């Protein structure tokens, strides 16, 4: 059920931070990623394989854990509004990022020619998003696994998620066979 | 055929001095606004206007939109347009207008105690029982008749929760966005209808499409009500021979400041 | 370089098969999951969590590697239309999986109440499709790293990815506090 | 009485096929622009219009301003309004337009190599010395006599504080917002004058008072010239019976998005 | 006013015996088909028909489509509508019709060897140089003046690469869906044009929306050319008083098998 | 000459305000259908039409066939044409339409409890005994009069076990064909007759010949009532000038969705 995904995401945040990712928390999500604020992170990550990163993102599923949260009864409208503003902010941020990959590619290439610059930018975006989610989770009070949902938040999430998925799908791009032979040997 | 301005039913129920009716003729249209343009500009710094939405197939569709009347040097109180129940009596100098206007405002903000006080204070005047009581009943009934339609609850709710006009994407640096839409719902139904019909979303969401009319918001919702001040910056300009001759009419692009705030989502089902 | 993606997808598939997933690959892509083929898989999976799974599928990213294999010059038209047909087939299979998720959930949970039911179903879908993809890769002949784009193939892939991702998006959901205590204490 | 458009002298220097002169009558006005509105909308994505600056004393002062001619889905070169020196030939594919158009564009960008190549290749054609030589001389002379006046006035502006036009993007963080101030300054005097008269600043400072018109930028300067890409967000929309019956003249408020970029400074003496 | 059928210019190149021309006036319509339906039905088991596409706002759009004429028990050779260049000579018994029809088929099939053989055989016959030389010259000129227009290439390719029609989206455990579309790319320009105009896509993709006009495939491209065979099952039936009286006209919904095969998508810019 | 629709006897038995009976002129015909076309399309997503079946001996024969009225984007409940007794009351909002319609449906689905509730609630109304009771008798009696013709049992069974219309040949992925066929047997005689005449067979067996008309099915039957879902694919499109000019009436073959389901076997003695 939902509690499984919630706890899994919490533990994933904790463990991924413990292994490699570290708080550069001076920067929030309100604006684009700041290469000047990530030179050290880029240099660190340049010495690893990032090819498992992919251009898509499960924004709807990613924010689904935060969906199930409330105290007993509707004490105030603060929770739902806070979440709505968060959702619209996230949608705008992702769309602007997707629209402006050329600017970031140029900016991060200026710091040096690195092969995995695309995956670097993608992970920068995701890490900023994760830190902002970490803070907003620090804001909230309590969650329950009763899985009582809200229709309006659900619809807003679905629509903005469709926009985000289409925006990332806009990604198109233009322009060692011994490894193919090795694969064919391995399968056979 | 019938005027639809809330203040159109204003009556100077002194039994001696008659009341005026300065409402503009257009108030009789079925726009949905419950205020005549003259009342709109007098009681608030607002001016009705329309924005058209075209297409590639030459289709017509349009919505209402408001306009500022506040200048630049005006600060603080003068910058409040539609205050909340907390700060309206102070900003509207209730001891200045007709008692009927005072009752109207107390009703607008659900100020029942002020209603009862004004009623039982008027009761003491001589000659009230003749016609002043019937006039006060007529005014109260007219106000309630205007109010009930806009309310979502009503008697038989004709609710259609299809327009997702959430009213807040401002990128407010402070992570306190949870106040804009937090308000605008604790208000009177008339206030909510007026603000909905007054300000048009900068970002439009229909089905799968996304539209942008203004790159950045213009007004903002705050605890003291709607305020016509773009956040984090000086206010926008408000203007209230040979070179001109050679510069003939060239689509002057009027410089007055409209209203722009919030996001609109529309499902396929809604009309 | 796209060849990074080539080798990355190849090695990810190879290692993912090596670790736990044993090839049960006789069935083709023209069909929906069959319980008889996956009962033991579900039973063994029950004890291993799969919440890592993302509901969405990177259709275009998944199918991009096999876009770029072609001997120089127009060696044969067969590869082009074969790839196009495979793309359409996978698209329709994904569409039908998304459309009829409830029936498959019921047909697979009839054998036992698990907490990863839909998770396991999506894993089965992805695993069977990936086995079919590995067989199709075993079908192909040779590749090149020259990275020549094809407008026709790319346009087809983009449109199909848009449709498929939207259909996946339409998937929705029916509308222990010490965990959050630990999370907040970690955050502070 | 005399037209002042560079394209107004466009002529097919073949002596056989007639040439077109679509320049509108307004191109005879010495208002400061140097393009006929027809050529402005044809070659560029611009449409002349004027904005009046009033005050509280009802005084008239108007300034030139331009308008978008791009939709939403157009990308790449289509988003460029005025290309830079390096990226003008590709966006204009000069090989497809008339040779006189190519010569005029080369003169505008001061592409001396292209002008010399066109001239010495035109030396080869037969009948050139008869009339095509004199036609090319007339075209070149007119182009020089239009360009020349601009360079002093642009130069003098680039000398002293009289009107400090800063193309610095507001809200410095913003987006790319490149300080292409010298890329503009790398434009020819005609291009610099055209862009100055086309786009107006968002903040204006007269004497000591401060005036603001837009809360955010509209266009942006890039290495590919002036591109109408709103910073930090999707581009704005460009539009290019019963309910309509009840909607009368209600201050239509044109929805097309005009140019707004940069910062201006006004000294007391300017008029 | 002028017929636009390839077979409409059939000429008996003997200068003695007259020739026939049974083309109906339908060939004068510029619908995209270049064969009078008489010749199409006579040579091929097809018939012109158009299926119009509607919308929600009452907008009209129509697209061409073919119709089967083969029977049920008819199997094999007769089942083929458009045979391939490999298997067209045998199925159409070129030794049966006039040599002009054979020339037309060979030019359509780009059988240059047959054209050269027919020309050099016609050289020998007595009286050929009198009139038959120029007769065959004009016939060949007309044939090529059609063929080039049919092909996308011509002197310069006037191709509208906007509508993407695949023609083979089927999946019935063929295991070689990639083989089903091997042809349609070896066909001549006119052959490809005619086959595309004849068969309509069961699935249509306009940008973001998906539409469907059939449940399952109708025909299929075979190595021996186009065949009026429905895959995955027995062939559908082909038809070639009281109850009728008591059941008046109720939209008969004609049952003759139409054409449905392949997949289509439209780009963003296409209109 | 006499009306033969179930909804023909629909009445608003208030003794003050009359009712509506917009049953189409075909309502009087003995077409075998027992619902007038207007009420059939309004209450159900069905459209009566005629399916002509010919032969090689030029023999005319037409069989009952319905047509879809549902779009594509509609999902779940809306795709369900004739719901079952367990899933019709929820989808048919009985408390919305007039009581007589509700009772009609209750009889249709054997909902005696709702008939008793309708009667006992109707007893409470004033003026009930005046004419309300007589009209409830009239409506109920006429409805039962239609029902008996529809129902096969009746008093004397006029059933001819000749048409083996089993209402499934689908080759479905799941081995539940014996279950889909197992359904349709819980439906009343009206429901079974209506579903029989609505859907035309795709496979028909008379004597020894095997008839086939569609390569694949059209709808499917579930316990939740008659639902329209093409097996294993997208939903078929529903529609609900120069090219038109150049394309004349060419056997348009309109693509409105016809129904198809079931395997038909006809004995030699059957007529």
């Amino acid at each position: 059920i939902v509690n499984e995904k919630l706890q899994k995401i919490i533990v994933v945040t904790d463990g991924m931070k413990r292994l490699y990712e570290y708080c550069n928390c001076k920067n929030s999500l309100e604006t684009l990623p700041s290469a000047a604020n990530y030179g050290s992170l880029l240099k660190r990550l340049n010495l690893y394989n990032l090819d498992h990163i992919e251009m898509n993102v499960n924004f709807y599923e990613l924010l689904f854990p935060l969906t199930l949260y409330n105290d007993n009864d509707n004490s105030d409208k603060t929770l739902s509004h806070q979440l709505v503003n968060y959702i619209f902010l996230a949608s705008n941020y992702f769309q602007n990022c997707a629209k402006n990959f050329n600017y970031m590619r140029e900016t991060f290439n200026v710091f040096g020619p690195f092969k995995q610059i695309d995956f670097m930018v993608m992970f920068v975006i995701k890490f900023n998003f994760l830190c902002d989610m970490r803070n907003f989770a620090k804001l909230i009070d309590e969650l329950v696994p009763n899985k009582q949902p809200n229709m309006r938040i659900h619809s807003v999430l679905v629509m903005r998620d469709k926009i985000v998925k289409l925006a990332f799908s806009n990604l198109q791009f233009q322009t060692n066979t011994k490894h193919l032979q090795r694969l064919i040997m391995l399968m056979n | 055929r019938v005027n639809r301005c809330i203040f159109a039913s204003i009556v100077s129920f002194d039994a001696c001095i008659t009341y005026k009716s300065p409402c503009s003729p257009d108030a009789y249209h079925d726009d949905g606004w419950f205020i005549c343009n003259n009342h709109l500009i007098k009681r608030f710094k607002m001016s009705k206007m329309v924005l058209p939405i075209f297409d590639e197939d030459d289709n017509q569709f349009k919505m209402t939109i408001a306009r500022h009347l506040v200048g630049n040097k005006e600060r603080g109180i003068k910058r409040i347009l539609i205050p909340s129940a907390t700060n309206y009596q102070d900003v509207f100098n209730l001891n200045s207008m007709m008692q009927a206007e005072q009752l109207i405002f107390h009703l607008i903000y659900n100020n029942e105690n002020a209603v009862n006080t004004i009623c039982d204070n008027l009761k003491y005047t001589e000659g009230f029982t003749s016609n002043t009581q019937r006039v006060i009943h007529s005014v109260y009934a007219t106000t309630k008749s205007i109010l009930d339609t806009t309310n979502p609850n009503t008697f038989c709710s004709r609710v259609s929760r299809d327009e997702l006009r959430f009213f807040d994407v401002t990128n407010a640096r402070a992570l306190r966005g949870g106040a804009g839409d937090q308000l605008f719902n604790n208000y009177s139904g008339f206030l909510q209808n007026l603000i909905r019909r007054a300000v048009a979303p900068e970002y439009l969401q229909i089905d799968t499409e996304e539209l942008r009319f203004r790159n950045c918001a213009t007004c903002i919702i705050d605890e003291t009500g709607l305020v016509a001040s773009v956040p984090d910056g000086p206010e926008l300009y408000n203007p209230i021979r040979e070179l001109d001759r050679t510069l003939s009419g060239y689509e002057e692009y009027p410089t007055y400041v409209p209203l722009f705030l919030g996001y609109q989502i529309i499902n396929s089902e809604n009309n």
Side-chain angles (χ1 to χ4, degrees), chain A, chain B:
Chain A
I1 64 180
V2 170
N3 164 69
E4 298 173 301
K5 174 173 297 181
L6 171 68
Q7 180 61 20
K8 186 74 174 178
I9 290 309
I10 294 161
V11 172
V12 161
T13 309
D14 312 346
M16 288 181 68
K17 187 176 178 298
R18 182 173 70 89
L19 279 168
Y20 303 96
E21 289 174 290
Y22 58 91
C23 159
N24 180 4
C25 303
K26 68 177 180 181
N27 178 38
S28 295
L29 195 60
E30 275 84 27
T31 61
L32 300 176
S34 167
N37 298 343
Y38 299 123
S40 297
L41 176 60
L42 302 150
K43 291 182 176 178
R44 175 68 179 279
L45 297 179
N46 190 41
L47 306 178
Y48 304 101
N49 186 313
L50 302 182
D51 297 350
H52 47 272
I53 294 180
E54 296 170 301
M55 301 306 290
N56 292 327
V57 56
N58 292 243
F59 161 90
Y60 181 88
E61 294 288 327
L62 197 57
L63 290 193
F64 194 87
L66 300 184
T67 312
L68 172 53
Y69 84 113
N70 50 12
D71 206 357
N72 284 335
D73 307 350
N74 295 311
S75 297
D76 210 329
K77 295 290 186 176
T78 307
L79 310 177
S80 295
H81 181 171
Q82 286 294 151
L83 195 64
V84 166
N85 179 33
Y86 198 108
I87 294 155
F88 276 134
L89 168 61
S91 177
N92 262 340
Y93 164 79
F94 276 166
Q95 198 190 40
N96 288 340
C97 291
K99 187 193 176 188
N100 305 291
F101 280 172
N102 297 343
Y103 285 149
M104 278 187 291
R105 194 178 305 105
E106 161 191 0
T107 305
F108 291 113
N109 190 10
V110 164
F111 283 11
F114 315 123
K115 304 174 182 176
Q116 296 176 9
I117 184 170
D118 311 346
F119 300 121
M120 283 204 298
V121 176
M122 292 297 298
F123 201 75
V124 164
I125 287 169
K126 285 192 171 184
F127 167 80
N128 265 330
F129 205 85
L130 295 156
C131 288
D132 192 67
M133 291 183 56
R134 188 170 184 88
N135 285 333
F136 180 44
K138 185 173 188 176
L139 287 177
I140 69 184
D141 294 314
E142 188 181 53
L143 287 82
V144 300
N146 282 342
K147 301 185 289 168
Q148 173 43 233
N150 171 281
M151 183 76 70
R152 193 164 186 79
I153 310 308
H154 164 78
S155 302
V156 174
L157 287 166
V158 166
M159 290 284 296
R160 302 305 295 177
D161 169 78
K162 281 193 168 180
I163 300 160
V164 167
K165 298 289 168 53
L166 289 170
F168 267 113
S169 186
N170 297 328
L171 284 166
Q172 298 186 38
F173 53 95
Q174 310 304 301
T175 176
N176 287 311
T177 56
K178 298 181 173 182
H179 308 109
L180 166 67
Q181 295 173 344
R182 291 176 181 173
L183 180 169
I184 296 168
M185 288 189 292
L186 290 165
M187 298 299 99
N188 295 312
Chain B
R1 63 186 189 277
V2 52
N3 196 317
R4 302 181 183 184
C5 165
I6 290 205
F7 304 116
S9 76
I10 193 64
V11 178
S12 67
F13 48 90
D14 192 19
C16 288
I17 295 90
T18 184
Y19 64 91
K20 290 280 295 305
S21 59
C23 271
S24 58
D26 50 359
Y28 292 65
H29 308 169
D30 57 358
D31 61 359
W33 293 60
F34 294 92
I35 292 182
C36 63
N37 184 9
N38 304 130
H39 278 129
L40 182 69
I41 67 175
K42 189 262 294 183
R43 285 291 84 196
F44 312 101
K45 323 299 190 307
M46 309 292 209
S47 180
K48 250 187 296 179
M49 44 188 221
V50 68
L51 163 73
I53 302 301
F54 286 106
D55 65 330
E56 282 89 359
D57 196 73
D58 213 355
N59 190 340
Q60 207 65 87
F61 161 64
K62 31 193 65 179
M63 59 194 308
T64 64
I65 188 67
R67 187 176 64 181
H68 291 169
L69 279 305
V70 293
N72 309 319
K73 301 297 182 165
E74 307 175 350
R75 300 291 293 277
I77 285 303
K78 268 81 170 183
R79 303 272 267 174
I80 301 178
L81 311 179
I82 313 295
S84 70
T86 65
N87 288 338
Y88 70 99
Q89 74 294 12
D90 46 1
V91 308
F92 292 120
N93 59 25
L94 291 178
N95 297 111
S96 60
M97 69 288 298
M98 301 203 199
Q99 286 252 309
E101 303 276 350
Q102 313 178 27
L103 178 68
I104 294 162
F105 283 112
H106 306 146
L107 266 178
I108 296 303
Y109 291 88
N110 192 6
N111 191 357
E112 57 86 14
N113 275 313
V115 170
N116 299 327
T117 55
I118 197 172
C119 170
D120 78 332
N121 274 317
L122 179 63
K123 188 70 187 71
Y124 300 148
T125 199
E126 189 191 7
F128 165 87
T129 306
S130 304
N131 289 339
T132 319
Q133 183 69 273
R134 75 177 184 171
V135 168
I136 213 61
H137 282 96
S138 291
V139 174
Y140 177 76
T142 308
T143 51
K144 284 308 305 309
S145 170
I146 307 301
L147 259 185
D148 62 354
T149 62
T150 66
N151 200 49
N153 320 320
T154 68
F155 199 69
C156 287
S157 64
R158 320 185 83 177
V159 56
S160 57
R161 192 176 185 84
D162 308 330
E163 298 156 288
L164 298 79
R165 184 76 165 106
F166 276 80
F167 267 177
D168 62 332
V169 50
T170 175
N171 192 7
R173 310 314 200 286
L175 185 63
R176 301 313 319 122
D181 182 24
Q182 146 65 22
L183 286 64
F184 154 78
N185 197 5
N186 197 25
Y187 297 172
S188 163
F190 175 63
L191 292 181
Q192 305 172 7
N193 180 20
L194 179 60
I195 181 185
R196 164 178 295 103
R197 306 320 281 258
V199 55
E202 59 284 17
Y203 274 75
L204 197 152
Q205 171 53 78
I206 280 175
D207 302 337
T208 179
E209 67 199 12
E210 183 178 2
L211 265 68
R212 211 188 181 182
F213 313 103
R214 272 299 191 93
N215 60 6
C216 296
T218 290
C219 66
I220 192 64
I221 297 298
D222 198 355
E223 191 280 335
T224 67
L226 179 54
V227 51
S229 178
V230 53
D232 207 328
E235 63 281 2
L236 298 170
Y237 176 72
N238 205 347
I240 307 305
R241 185 149 43 242
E242 189 278 333
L243 197 56
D244 305 343
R245 179 196 302 104
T246 176
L247 272 62
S248 180
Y250 287 159
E251 288 85 10
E252 290 67 6
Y253 176 65
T255 182
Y256 46 64
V257 177
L259 279 293
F260 274 112
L261 165 62
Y263 193 88
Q264 206 172 15
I265 308 183
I266 304 299
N267 291 332
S268 47
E269 179 267 333
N270 194 16
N271 51 7

